[PDB]
Amino acid sequence: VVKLQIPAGKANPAPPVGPALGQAGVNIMGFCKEFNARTADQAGLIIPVEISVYEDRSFTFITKTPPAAVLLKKAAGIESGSGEPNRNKVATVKRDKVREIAETKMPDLNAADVEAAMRMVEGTARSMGIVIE
Amino acid sequence: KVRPSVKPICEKCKVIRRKGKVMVICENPKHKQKQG
Amino acid sequence: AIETKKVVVEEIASKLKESKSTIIVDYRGLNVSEVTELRKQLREANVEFKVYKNTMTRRAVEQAELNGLNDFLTGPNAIAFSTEDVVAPAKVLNDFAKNHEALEIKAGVIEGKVSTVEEVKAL
Amino acid sequence: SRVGKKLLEIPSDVTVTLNDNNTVAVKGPKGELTRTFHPDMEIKVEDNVLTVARPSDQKEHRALHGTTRSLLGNMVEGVSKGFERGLELVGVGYRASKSGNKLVLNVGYSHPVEIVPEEGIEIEVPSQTKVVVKGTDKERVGAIAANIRAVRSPEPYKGKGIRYEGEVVRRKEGK
Amino acid sequence: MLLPKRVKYRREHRGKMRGRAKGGTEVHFGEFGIQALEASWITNRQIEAARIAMTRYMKRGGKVWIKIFPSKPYTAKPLEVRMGSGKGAPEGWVAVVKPGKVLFEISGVSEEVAREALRLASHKLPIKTKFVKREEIG
RNA sequence: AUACGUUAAGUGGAAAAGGAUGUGGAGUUGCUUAGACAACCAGGAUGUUGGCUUAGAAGCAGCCACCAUUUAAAGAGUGCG
């Protein structure tokens, strides 16, 4: 099992994929069409993909959401957070806005509940130093 | 090594007297020591 | 020892309203194997199900002194008790059985628990 | 919480004589042993169960009492199941083969290596890599295992010569 | 490195130490402090050797306390000079020390760090010493 | 010689700072048959390396807000890597 961050819009050249999965016995030609299929809904983003390795050289893949807290910069409206969080509260975000963010992360999050999904994001918003309001 | 004031250096080290002479022993060979 | 009483009195409250339960051996209890079961609890309900591996004969068996007096035989060796709150019984007896058959933790050949006054044979 | 108070069952068939003072002549199909015992210790034979008891709680007695049980358990098992210690040779041209009771060792020294087992001990060579020293005496099998190890002290830089199976020799980076 | 701005006399008698300390036996300015078991002379350089050892290990923290300011000179006749022909000169300074006296104090520091800072000072000081804490009956 | 002990090195019959599961007594305290120290079999966190960074270094360049959930349990980290 070797996780990789294959881009959604492209999958063919050796240097990003190539030998690294080619030594796994993976048939690269047969899967590249698949990476361009389901990920087309979210083109232009770098989508991480888990890769299990069956003994029969069969394969099944699971796509994931773009990485967490990147969205927090957008909701804050600021390009970058403080280098000194809490000591420097550069930005603030409403609790209702956090609800919009947590729902996007649900397939990636292992959180049992939406109320718990809130608390997970709350630990990320504090990393940016952003106040929770 | 041999010094009058043998002391533990890491948690893996253990103090064990042998033949009337205290010796500290560890999984790392460098930490091995004996007093006297 | 006051903390131990919280371990006792709380679990008894579940057993008084408990409906069904199943034996689960603790051997080779991989964390990934647990998550596969925990997700099933999320479908059946929420936090209402309990995994609590407080399976000492000095612990859980004392809870069984009030009700479910069939745990005395199951008490030796590893156990993973489960308790139901609401949820009409069905899949709960079946879901864990499917897991052990595909590797992941010995089932103990299902020693069985309270349902009537019996033991072995999940339905 | 203690060593010698524990009972030792005899699976059988292992008889145990109680001859003074004190000699314990354990007997059976595999062999016999006579461990030395100072008088202060008290050995007794429950039916198919050896027993040991401490005369006092004094610190000197506390040490000796835990040793006497561990030895007797080593004795009975060697009279029954027996014992063996593997030795994993590692290298390229290294190999070993018997020549009579003697065990020739083609160690990398230009001088040929030979080791003669003591009576009651034999060394089969199922493969050139593995080495097995069968014997009823743990003190002797471990001694012979050390004597064979003496022929080649292991090199931390590379797996060579005698090596216990299994054991991790410390890794070293050459340059 | 601590020396008096002025002294009434260039030289003084070496004296004769005896008995329990006249005072300062009980630490209170600091949460913890070194306490000598015996009595012996301490040169000014020995005091500086102790404080430098603590400031590094302590890092950020409360100010180091020093209850003892040296005042008694130790005479040092130049080498190979014959006996007599006048008293020598004060090469340096030495504080008087008595058993049970609080040689140093530390405060505002965590319990783990405090155990070490008192220990490193004990090596620089020839006198045997022991760990001490404030009493509050009180 | 008698009685209660202590000492194991020839200490007794040669010093020190310092070091040590040496041993004999005394005291205090944590846990502990609603379970202790040893184990031997179980698993190791979830988003996540998480913010600020250094090409990248995800338990770990190092500076830290070092969060909250899954819960029988685990620090967004004890350590060999």
Question: Is residue E43 a contact partner of residue E92, using CB atoms and an 8 Å limit?
Answer: yes
**Bond before E138 cis per omega within 30 degrees:** yes
The correct answer on CATH 1.10.340.70 for the domain covering A68-132 is no
Residue nearest to nucleotide F81 (CA to C1'): D171
Name the nucleotide with the smallest C1'–CA separation from A83.
Answer: F52
The whole-angstrom separation of Cα E1 and Cα E92 is 11
DSSP letter at D161?
A: B
Could you check: is the Cβ of residue B21 within 7 Å of any atom of nucleic acid strand F? no
The whole-angstrom separation of Cα D107 and Cα D128 is 12
Could you check: is the Cβ of residue A104 within 7 Å of any atom of nucleic acid strand F? no
The token pair at C29 is 């209890």
For residue E28, give Cα distances in angstroms to B9, E65, E106, E127, E132. 34, 11, 10, 22, 11
Residues of C with CB under 8 A from a CB of A: 35, 38, 42, 46-47
Q: Give kind and range of the element (H or E) at residue D23.
A: strand D23-26
Nearest CA in chain A to C36: A110
DSSP letter at A51?
A: E
Could you check: is the Cβ of residue C41 within 7 Å of any atom of nucleic acid strand F? yes
Return the exposure string of C84-119: e unless at least 16 CB atoms fall within 10 Å of the residue's CB, then b: beeeeeeebbebbeebbeeebbebbebbbbbbeeee
The whole-angstrom separation of Cα C114 and Cα E66 is 74
B14-18/A131-132 β-pairing: unpaired
Close Cβ partners of D84 (under 8 Å, ≥ 6 residues apart)? D132, D133, D134, D135, D141
DSSP E98-114: -TT-B--BB-S--HHHH
Interchain pair A112, C35: CB under 8 A: no
CA of D20 and C1' of F12: distance in angstroms? 40
- What angle is formed at CA C33 by the lines to CA C28 and CA C36, rounded to 5 degrees? 160
Could you check: is the Cβ of residue A68 within 7 Å of any atom of nucleic acid strand F? yes
Interchain pair C42, A112: CB under 8 A: yes
- Contacts C46 to A, Cβ<8 Å: 112-113
In angstroms, the separation between the Cα of residue A111 and the nearest Cα of chain C is 10
Residue nearest to nucleotide F66 (CA to C1'): A127
A3-63: CATH architecture: 2-Layer Sandwich (3.30)
Domain range annotation of chain E: 23-138
D150, exposed or middle or buried, with CB in 10 Å at 0-12, 13-18, 19+? exposed
Question: Is residue C80 a contact partner of residue C26, using CB atoms and an 8 Å limit?
Answer: yes
DSSP letter at B30?
A: G
Q: How far is CA E118 from the centre of its chain?
A: 13
The whole-angstrom separation of Cα C89 and Cα B20 is 71
CA of A127 and C1' of F76: distance in angstroms? 11
E46, exposed or middle or buried, with CB in 10 Å at 0-12, 13-18, 19+? middle
- Positions on chain F within 7 A of a protein C-beta: 9, 16-24, 32-37, 41-48, 50-53, 64-65, 67-74, 76
Name the nucleotide with the smallest C1'–CA separation from A128.
Answer: F51
Question: Is residue D119 a contact partner of residue D101, using CB atoms and an 8 Å limit?
Answer: no
The whole-angstrom separation of Cα E127 and Cα E138 is 31
Phi, psi of C51 (to 5 degrees): -95, -30
First-to-last alpha carbon distance for chain E, in angstroms, is 36
Nearest CA in chain A to C43: A112
For chain E, list the contacting chains (3+ Cβ pairs, <8 Å). none
Nearest CA in chain A to C41: A112
Taking each helix axis as running N to C, give the angle between helix A95-104 and helix A114-125, from 0 to 180 degrees, rounded to the nearest 10: 110
- The upper half-sphere exposure of residue E115, i.e. CA atoms within 13 Å in the direction of its Cβ, equals 2
Nearest residue to D51 (alpha-carbon basis) of D80, D72, D26, D77? D72
Domain range annotation of chain A: 3-63, 68-132
The token pair at D164 is 């216990």
Close Cβ partners of E16 (under 8 Å, ≥ 6 residues apart)? none
The whole-angstrom separation of Cα C74 and Cα C111 is 7
Q: Give the dihedral sign, CA C50/C52/C53/C56.
A: negative
What SS3 class is residue A92?
strand
Question: Is residue D134 a contact partner of residue D83, using CB atoms and an 8 Å limit?
Answer: yes
Q: Is E124 left (phi over 0), alpha (psi -120 to 50) or beta?
A: alpha
B21-25/D49-53 β-pairing: unpaired
Close Cβ partners of E128 (under 8 Å, ≥ 6 residues apart)? E36, E37, E38, E122
D83-164: CATH architecture: Alpha-Beta Complex (3.90)
Q: Tell me whether chains C and A touch (3+ CB pairs under 8 A).
A: yes
Return the exposure string of E10-42: e unless at least 16 CB atoms fall within 10 Å of the residue's CB, then b: eeeeeeeeeeebeeeeebeebbbbbbbeebebb
What SS3 class is residue B23?
strand
The whole-angstrom separation of Cα B27 and Cα C1 is 39
**β-sheet bridge partners, residue D51:** D44
D15-81: CATH architecture: Alpha-Beta Complex (3.90)
Nearest residue to D96 (alpha-carbon basis) of D115, D110, D82? D115
Question: Is residue C46 a contact partner of residue A112, using CB atoms and an 8 Å limit?
Answer: yes
The whole-angstrom separation of Cα D29 and Cα A87 is 80
D75, exposed or middle or buried, with CB in 10 Å at 0-12, 13-18, 19+? buried
Q: Give the dihedral sign, CA D132/D137/D142/D145.
A: negative
The token pair at A72 is 């927090």
Q: How many Cβ atoms sit within 10 Å of the Cβ of residue C8? A: 13
Return the exposure string of E67-103: e unless at least 16 CB atoms fall within 10 Å of the residue's CB, then b: bbebebbbeeeeeeeeeeeeeeebeebbbbbbbbbbb
DSSP D105-139: EE-SSSS-EEE-PPTTEEEE-SSSS--EEEES-HH
Question: Is residue A72 a contact partner of residue A130, using CB atoms and an 8 Å limit?
Answer: yes
Question: Is residue E24 a contact partner of residue E67, using CB atoms and an 8 Å limit?
Answer: yes
For residue D82, give Cα distances in angstroms to B21, D27, D101, D133. 38, 13, 20, 11
Q: How many Cβ atoms sit within 10 Å of the Cβ of residue D54? A: 18
Q: Please list the residue range(s) of chain D that carry CATH number 3.90.930.12.
A: 15-81, 83-164
The whole-angstrom separation of Cα E59 and Cα E117 is 11
Nearest residue to A37 (alpha-carbon basis) of A8, A17, A74? A8
CA of B21 and C1' of F10: distance in angstroms? 18
The token pair at B18 is 């042998």
Name the nucleotide with the smallest C1'–CA separation from A108.
Answer: F47
D83, exposed or middle or buried, with CB in 10 Å at 0-12, 13-18, 19+? middle
Rg (CA), chain D: 20
For residue B22, give Cα distances in angstroms to B9, B13, B33, D59, E129. 15, 13, 8, 20, 24
The whole-angstrom separation of Cα A40 and Cα A47 is 11
- Contacts A113 to C, Cβ<8 Å: 46
- What angle is formed at CA D116 by the lines to CA D114 and CA D122, rounded to 5 degrees? 120
